Amino acid sequence: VFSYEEVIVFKDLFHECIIGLKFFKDHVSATKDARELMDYLAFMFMQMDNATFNEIIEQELPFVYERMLEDSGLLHVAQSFLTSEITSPNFAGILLRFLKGKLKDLGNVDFNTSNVLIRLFKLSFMSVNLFPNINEVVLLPHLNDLILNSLKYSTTAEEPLVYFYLIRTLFRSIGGGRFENLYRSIKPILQVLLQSLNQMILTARLPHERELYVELCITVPVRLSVLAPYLPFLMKPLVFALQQYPDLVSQGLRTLELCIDNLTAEYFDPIIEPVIDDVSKALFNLLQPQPFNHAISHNVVRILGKLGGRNRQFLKPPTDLTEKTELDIDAIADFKINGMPEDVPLSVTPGIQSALNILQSYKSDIHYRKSAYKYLTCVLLLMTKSSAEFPTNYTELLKTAVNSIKLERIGIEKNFDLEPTVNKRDYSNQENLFLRLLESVFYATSIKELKDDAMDLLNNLLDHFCLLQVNTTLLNKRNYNGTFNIDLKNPNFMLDSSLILDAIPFALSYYIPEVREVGVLAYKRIYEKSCLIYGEELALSHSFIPELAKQFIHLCYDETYYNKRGGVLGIKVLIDNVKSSSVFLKKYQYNLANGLLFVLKDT
Amino acid sequence: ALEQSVKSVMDVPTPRRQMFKTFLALQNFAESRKGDQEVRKLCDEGIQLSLIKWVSLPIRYTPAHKWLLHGFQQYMEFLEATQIYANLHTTTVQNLDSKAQEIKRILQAWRDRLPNTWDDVNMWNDLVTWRQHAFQVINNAYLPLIPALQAYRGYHEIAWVINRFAHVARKHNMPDVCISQLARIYTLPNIEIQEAFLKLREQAKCHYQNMNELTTGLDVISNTNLVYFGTVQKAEFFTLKGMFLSKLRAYEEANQAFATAVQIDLNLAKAWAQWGFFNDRRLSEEPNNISFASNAISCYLQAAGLYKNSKIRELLCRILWLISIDDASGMLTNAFDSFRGEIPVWYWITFIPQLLTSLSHKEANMVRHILIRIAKSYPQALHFQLRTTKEDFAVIQ
């Protein structure tokens, strides 16, 4: 026991010893003399009574925490309180009740504060598995609240991966204990929130976002050998764990063994049935010889040997034969070879899929990335070249074609001659190819020292498509001037310049915000150009601005939150542009309201 | 004489000759205890050889990959046989029922780990022969410990991997080896509760085709009256007598054989199904309006109540076709409506159109009980068909 004027002296001693570690900074990364004094300060307070040390550390822990945000070596204080003490559960309780309050702003702070908070959480979890028989009962209250509040606070967080990182650290800190039975009342909500975050990143962040979610969805702690009846929640991340991440593989294989060893082979076989072809096809990729790791190959051999005929009774003839998409087709031009009398036709697209994979990956060297970008723009400008020629009187023809929209009953000269058909497969492949190249021009603005020429080329392409839209406007009067005309003349079959109606809603729905900014800049630019070449009174009824607006409403009805964000971005820039006229926003009010209401219902 | 034959050919090695070398090392560990544990090295070099052979093949699954999968199972059974023999070498102090549980667990894992029935008979034969080697080792090592016990722990469950082989060759239309494999079962002269079961069942199913052989199935069952540890084997014996007697032209004696096959248990649905087939074969020489068909539909309805989770839909087809006769006497409706048992409501789903066009046909209100039991348990199967045929009949009134 102590009096009041003795515990005041002990509080001031702890305060001055924590302040005095500022003399020994640089001027778990601390200097040797500061580490020695932190060992002295930790050992000094170990033999004090626990009932006074608890109130000293509880009154001092916010000040110790705000001193940790300047000299980060003071974590070696708290570690030395909970790695070896007779009063380790008490400090673990004080620290967990402090971090429970600090958890709400764990996402919305900078890198230093989030780093310090994650290290305090990691220390508090390692204190549990360092002393199992001594109190881990300090952790089992506010354990489900930790999981639930991390999942809830990651919704409105600015950096929402720190919460998942925390759930991963908590799962990797435990396993082999008793308190995984109060945790079994959280498994369905955790696994639905993990699978519906696992596959809803169809435009994944490109970091460890997919790896983190599939690492969380498997490797949950279950007291029973087979975790739960909630095993079909694990079948879709098991395919990703075996298939796409070679550092998750040795985890997921272990999970398979835990299902293959004791599941009775009757209950388990309908569960793996929707995934057995993907599971076996990713398992067959891991059967590689000795330069590849034999610790994860002999696992696959053991699994496939423990399954007698069950490793091959569910495979049929292959239903996945690749049918030569737009990343596989040839666009053929003539090249002059010096050893030949005439030019020779060869394909300009043998490295499109490779150049897209080079451009997408951050790791590749800038020279390779810049040459890949130059290759894609070469193929794209070759596809755009044979419409880039303009007549000598294009200004008066454009003016005539834009004031000829406001006339009624345009007489159509009739002629009786057939046009050739479309060949839908080659048209679809060329359309998707132009779309992929335009989308990579939009993606190129997310890279420094590729952004300036990408923005210049994008401005040229956008005000080219704005000038090509007037042909589609003039040809949509073939749908009028005669309610059934069959004897008219149409230009045969081309890329109809309505594939900027699939690229600008792509750029708004993309998972880099720096290209969503380029998407809204693209919409502002085509708004300016469409108001320029038409006039404001009819650019809202005939130009891109009505048409693309309908696309924005269609983005509100999609089945993932990326396209809904793109739709509300397009709707917000639309209703910030058009407010001077009261015909467009009042004509389109019901559909816009239903779209913005469907974003609220379905999300 | 086998080691020299292996060593002369175990250059430019294949996975098969490597498997033979690993089995020779395993037998060296088996017959001479405190062996080598180079079996743990030969299995690993065989796994690496098989992985090189797997990468040498195409990426997508070819039929050649099936033998590599069988080789993986053979190496894992080699390692489990190493564990079996290591447990078998420490039970020399007569520590039975303490280490026999591990042997029983690995043998029970082996009984459920057998290839698919459409796989090659060389695959089946290879697994059967090397499991017979692994069983011969434990039968040799339990042989000194027999008289010192004073049934017993000498297994001789080799008969299992004979019988399961002798079944599957009969699936592969190889009846000569299916008869010839039921001759290596006489290594122990006792009648077991399951060896005699599959032995007599497969020997009676041998003489079912090639109709100059049915008398050889008749004379082998008709003289065996001592029960081979069971009261269900005599019922299937009696209905197999019914099959063999009804295969030749016999009117009443085959009916008597089916009656004495069916009175004993009332729990074998194969007897009910074969009695229904026999009544249909008697029906096929006359018009289908004779009230003898009520016996056929009663044996069919009994043959679908407890024959569940199987191929019963042809019995339901026979019911739907034999019901549709135009008899004036109400004997068939009695035979349907006095059935005491639970009708397989889920298997009546696949004939929902043939039920729903049976309401328009007359002499059919016993279809209504089936459709009512469908609608109260499986409501989404009937709904679209009901609305379609309802709006069909509603516009023709």
């Binding site: 004791n262 610790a295 002999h298 423990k306 | 591990e102 667990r105």
Partner: peptide, 26 residues
């Protein structure tokens, strides 16, 4: 019903060292 008993645990090796075979003129 849902669970079966424990399978025999086959211990895979940790430090196996096999030789990559030289190609042959087969």
């Amino acid at each position: 019903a849902i669970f079966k008993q424990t399978e025999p645990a086959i211990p895979i090796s940790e430090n196996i060292s096999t030789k990559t075979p030289a190609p042959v003129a087969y």
